[PDB]
Write a protein that binds this DNA or RNA. Structure first.
Length: 242
DNA sequence: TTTTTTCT
DNA sequence: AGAAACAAA
């Protein structure tokens, strides 16, 4: 039921989500690697551009983000659009819908050019603004999957380069996609957006932090490195969702 | 079809 | 709103 899931997620806490994000999450590892090989502004711009083409992949997400990170390390990037025009058609893990994806990057390039270091700090302090602003530049609904996850991925990148932590806003949801629809169906007949926003609000853990916890646990990532109390609560969530 | 999107 | 975009199994 929602109440038991929210209770356990509340005990895991933002602290538990942050532990998984920073120690286990392979997209965070990929971003940390790239953050050492390119300047911080370009790094964040590339992370957002990459999120916006991270749909309908031909590989798992963790394979794709590592491909991205290793490709761009050390590169001299000027136009993000020109860089993706070379990168995407030769990638292994993102071969579908490339013309459409490239046009999204072309459309967002002007907005990306506003991301000075200071503007990045301002958005990390107000990620709801970033969320709305990315959507506005693309002419789309901010509720959409790739706009939400571009904020999530921006949050990882900013945390690394600014060496400080702000939690994701409570108002940014886990958005619908096939995998959250499938998981949620196992647990409830409620629609996912409403279900997970209720759990987020009851637990005190914003939805995007809940997203960090769900997928490693479902995919069998080991929780053994967590200290004993957190480990127990992670193990309790695995019993509910797997 | 199944593993998000544009266009308007 | 919903057809069409594109690769693989």
């Amino acid at each position: 039921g929602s109440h038991m899931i929210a209770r356990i997620i509340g005990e895991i806490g933002i602290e538990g989500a942050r532990f998984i994000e920073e120690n286990i999450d392979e997209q965070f590892k990929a971003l940390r690697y790239l953050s050492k090989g390119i300047d911080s502004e370009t790094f964040v711009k590339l992370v957002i551009a990459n999120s916006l083409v991270s749909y309908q992949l031909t590989g798992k997400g963790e394979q794709w983000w590592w491909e991205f990170a290793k490709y761009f390390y050390g590169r001299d990037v000027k136009s993000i659009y020109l860089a993706y025009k070379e990168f995407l058609p030769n990638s292994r893990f993102n071969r579908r819908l490339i013309p459409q994806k490239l046009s999204r990057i072309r459309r967002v390039e002007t907005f990306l050019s506003t991301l000075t270091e200071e503007r990045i700090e301002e958005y990390y302090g107000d990620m709801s603004s970033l969320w709305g602003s990315i959507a506005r530049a693309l002419g789309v609904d901010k509720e959409s999957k790739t706009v939400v996850f571009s904020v999530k991925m921006f949050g990882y990148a900013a945390r690394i380069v600014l060496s400080t932590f702000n939690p994701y806003p409570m108002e940014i949801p886990i958005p619908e996609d096939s995998r959250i629809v499938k998981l949620t169906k196992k647990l409830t007949n409620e629609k996912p957006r409403k279900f997970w926003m209720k759990i987020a609000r009851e637990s005190g853990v914003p939805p995007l932090h809940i997203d960090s916890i769900l997928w490693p646990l479902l995919g069998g990532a080991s929780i053994d490195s967590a200290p004993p109390e957190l480990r127990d609560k992670l193990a309790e969530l695995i019993k509910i969702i797997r």
